[PDB]
Amino acid sequence: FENYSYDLDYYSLESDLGVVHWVSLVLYCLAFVLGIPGNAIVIWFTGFKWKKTVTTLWFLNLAIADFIFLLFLPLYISYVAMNFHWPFGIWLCKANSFTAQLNMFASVFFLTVISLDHYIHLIHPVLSHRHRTLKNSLIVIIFIWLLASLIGGPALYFRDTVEFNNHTLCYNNFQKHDPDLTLIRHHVLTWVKFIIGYLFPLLTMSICYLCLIFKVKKRSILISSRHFWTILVVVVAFVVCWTPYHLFSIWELTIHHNSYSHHVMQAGIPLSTGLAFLNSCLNPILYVLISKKFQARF
Amino acid sequence: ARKLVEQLKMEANIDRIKVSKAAADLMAYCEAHAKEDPLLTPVPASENPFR
Amino acid sequence: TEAQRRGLQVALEEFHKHPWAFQETSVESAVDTPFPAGIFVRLEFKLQQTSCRKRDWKKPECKVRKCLACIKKVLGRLVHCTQCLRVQRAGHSFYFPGQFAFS
Amino acid sequence: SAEDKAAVERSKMIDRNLREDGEKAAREVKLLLLGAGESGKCTIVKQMTGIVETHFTFKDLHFKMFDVTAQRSERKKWIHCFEGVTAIIFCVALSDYDLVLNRMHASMKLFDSICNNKWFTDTSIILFLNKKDLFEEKIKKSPLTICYPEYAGSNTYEEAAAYIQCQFEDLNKRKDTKEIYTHFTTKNVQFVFDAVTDVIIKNNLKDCGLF
Amino acid sequence: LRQEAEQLKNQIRDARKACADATLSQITNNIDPVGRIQMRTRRTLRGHLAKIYAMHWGTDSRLLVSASQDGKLIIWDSYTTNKVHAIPLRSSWVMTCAYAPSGNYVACGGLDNICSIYNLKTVRVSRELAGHTGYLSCCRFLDDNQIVTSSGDTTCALWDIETGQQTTTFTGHTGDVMSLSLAPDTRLFVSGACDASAKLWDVREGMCRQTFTGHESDINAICFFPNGNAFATGSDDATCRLFDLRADQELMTYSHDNIICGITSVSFSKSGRLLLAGYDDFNCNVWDALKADRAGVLAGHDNRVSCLGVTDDGMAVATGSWDSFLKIWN
């Protein structure tokens, strides 16, 4: 009749202090079904022209980022579907967090650089003819990858796995490392993430696309019928999904009227995350396989 | 057209042989150098610089 | 004190609820810090090994055979035999910021 | 095997130099002068053996004009080498309708032959109607009935020039892939710059558009 | 003397037809076909940034020259796909290039009325031969001191590199001269013009001896048989013809109903059994030189195969096309 040994060790952090849950998993499943298959098809079929210009490189990078993000999504759906229980180790949770940040920032930056490149394309016919080399595209994609990989410290110092009552949990811990780091590493990191991953990209997309559509270069030989609708649709798709996620990220203020005052413990934030996954899934299908340039070879 | 007349006369004065003789000579050359043609007889990769 | 005795009794009951019962063997004192909430204690002590009888109630009735307790009638306990900072401040707390992201 | 290392290092240097030269050359814009004859290829835009080279920079754009005054041989033997030019400048000297060598008929024949050609199925043609000052004086003396028949308009410079432009414009048969930029002779350089900018926009959008 | 010229032409035609008694294909039916030929792209040479217009294999069968519209003459090492030399030609319009038999010189030319000769090992300009009023179509090296050129003004010229002046002028063509080939003994050379006629010229004598006709369009390519007693020509009407110098008459014709596009380049194998011809249908095909059949196709080029060549050892064939690539087949 022995449950332990001479040194009795255990841990127990017990503490006494539906309609949305199902929709989140449904959205995750639809995003995954519409994703990995479509992204894999895009990757395998993108051989339109060998060593094609920068647009194919942008599309390949975006598709790869979305494919990795959506193939690591099932880990998140398993975590959320088990009543917020994370049975995996700290190393796997750290790896998932790091790769998720890398993929999402890479996708956002690639979309932003696509918009900037298109704006320089149509508006500028002279300075875009001397700065569109393939080596420059390789340099800028390498810089984008480096910037997305070397931003934020989830490197096992800002994320720890701590089991709560009867449920294991891995989470970002911006505390318990130093008493001096009080409200100086949780808000600064969130603000930096919001300003680099949402503020500058959204501003650039908005200004470039609006100035491109409204003024249409004041020149003819542009099909404004499809172009305007496509630009508006892509802008709407980008805005309507990442915005709730970023407001929930900036919502981490912890004092409005009570402990939560927003009932965030439910699947509202997971639903917004699923909307972000839906936008990531919907981007490649809305860029690469719907335009008039393609759809003629198949 | 004196130059053309002279050229035609020179061409007509050139001796010609039978077509069959030329064909036989070409065939003799072909089967004489057939063994030395790498594009005709396949060459092993042991002595092939292009593998 | 009485609060420390109640806290150690609650910790032993939690031990007996799920992992045979073992009593204290290397007893030790405590310091406590009564200010947040009604009470708060910081008591450490060793336990016994095996048992003379199994399932002999939550309280130890078997005379013959370095922990860490930070409890707040208890709204939270992390007895493991540390994160006492947030538990002592529970009496809004236990947020564990995030919990909802791919991060 | 240090010889192999030296050879591959030399090859790497050679291919780097080749890539740099290709990148430098791709940024420039090239035009081909293909005027009618005795008043064409020897254009007026020059003055500001084999192929004649002209290099000039305008609005941060390096124009290389290839003039063909020699090579009276067959055109199709060397015309296929010019399927890389941004535009073809066709210069027609006005007031030559009365002159015979008939010259305007040869100009139309050359324009139809090159404009409706397989190699230049997408290259833009910039028509330059020169000697308009002499043309205005010659209309008052020599009517436009001797050449370009069915001339119903009066002997006026404006209507005659409009008729010339229409008779040169309607000669094109594609009308979709290529467009003819007609101008009357720093207006010439600005017109050429605008035409080549439009051609660059169209050609580069045909590949990297992605609206 | 139009009547005298017509009578002489009729007599020459009658004498030529008298010697004809049997077609080439009539007596070659006893030779087994060699149509079971499947050549694969052994090597791929890249680096050109424009349409490749001409090439020439080296005597050592390891180094080859290549000319394209970018203005660069590239000398490669086909054994290891390593670029050996890169000459920045001053003229971007290049149609022909040559490699010296001793390997110490290279040649180039095009829409400049000048054939430029460079020395590899002593790259600097060595000679610029000028004097032609038309575009050069083929510069070919006889030795280190004599070169032969053909221009678009219906004139061929045997030059002298040491003096930089023409030594012999060959005239008589009506249409623009398109190609020339040198005999193995370096004493005779046949060249074809746009008038659908190919004339044979003597280097030492400097006068024409034989004229071959029969084509309905321009003759674009020419190449001697390895024995030097015959040569094959390709035209723009999807037709090739074999002519014999001794017979002075067309021997046998290569044509296909499916093929409509003309021939841009042609060459013979080491034994002369295989005739590799490049067409405008984005493909190059091999013909049985003694049976007029097709043994295979060298598909793989993304544009028109402008030029092709066979090594002296005949171990491989190099094809350059407008797709800015070189392919070594073995």
Residue numbers in the entry:
A (entry chain R): 12 to 28, 35 to 315
B (entry chain C): 12 to 62
C (entry chain L): 23 to 41, 45 to 90, 97 to 103, 109 to 117, 133 to 142, 146 to 157
D (entry chain A): 6 to 53, 182 to 234, 241 to 324, 329 to 354
E (entry chain B): 7 to 128, 133 to 340
Question: What are the paper's exact sentences on this?
Answer:
Although both receptors recognize the same ligand, chemerin, and share high sequence identity, they exhibit distinct signaling properties and biological functions. CMKLR1 is the canonical chemerin receptor that mediates both G protein and arrestin signaling, while GPR1 exhibits weak G protein signaling but strong arrestin-dependent and -independent internalization.
Aiming to improve protein stability and yield, the residues L323–Q355 at the C-terminus of GPR1 were truncated. In the chemerin–CMKLR1–Gi1 structure, the long axis of the chemerin core is perpendicular to the membrane plane, while in the chemerin–GPR1–Gi1 structure, the ligand core shifts towards the second extracellular loop (ECL2) with its long axis forming a 45° angle with the membrane plane. Indeed, in the structures of chemerin–GPR1–Gi1, the receptor N-terminus makes extensive interactions with the core region of chemerin, with its residues D20–D27 running anti-parallelly with the residues L111–C117 in chemerin, forming a compact β-sheet. In addition to the interactions formed by the receptor N-terminus, ECL2 also stabilizes the binding between the receptor and chemerin core by not only interacting with the helical region prior to the C-terminus in chemerin but also making close contact with the receptor N-terminus. Thus, the inactive conformation of GPR1 is more stable and the receptor is unfavorable for G protein binding, as evidenced by our functional data and the relatively poor densities of the chemerin core and the Gα C-terminus in the cryo-EM map of the chemerin–GPR1–Gi1 complex. While in the GPR1 complex, the Gi1 protein exhibits an atypical binding mode to the receptor, with the α5 helix moving towards ICL1, resulting in a 10-degree rotation of the αN helix relative to that in the chemerin–CMKLR1–Gi1 structure.
